[PDB]
Structure formats: structure tokens, C-alpha cells
């Protein structure tokens, strides 16, 4: 799992950040 195991790495770390982003700039 090479890339796998960073791909639950990164999308652990990645896909919970990019879950919480935005920017409304109101």
C-alpha cells in the first residue's frame, strides 16, 4: 500500500481539511 496506505494518510488529512474549507468573503 505504497501510495495506498498515504492515500488514507492524505486523504485522511486532505479530505477532512478540504471538508472544512470555504470562503464566503462577506
Do not use: V, Y
Amino acid at each position: 500500500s505504497a501510495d495506498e496506505e498515504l492515500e488514507a494518510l492524505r486523504r485522511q488529512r486532505l479530505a477532512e481539511l478540504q471538508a472544512k474549507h470555504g470562503d464566503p468573503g462577506d
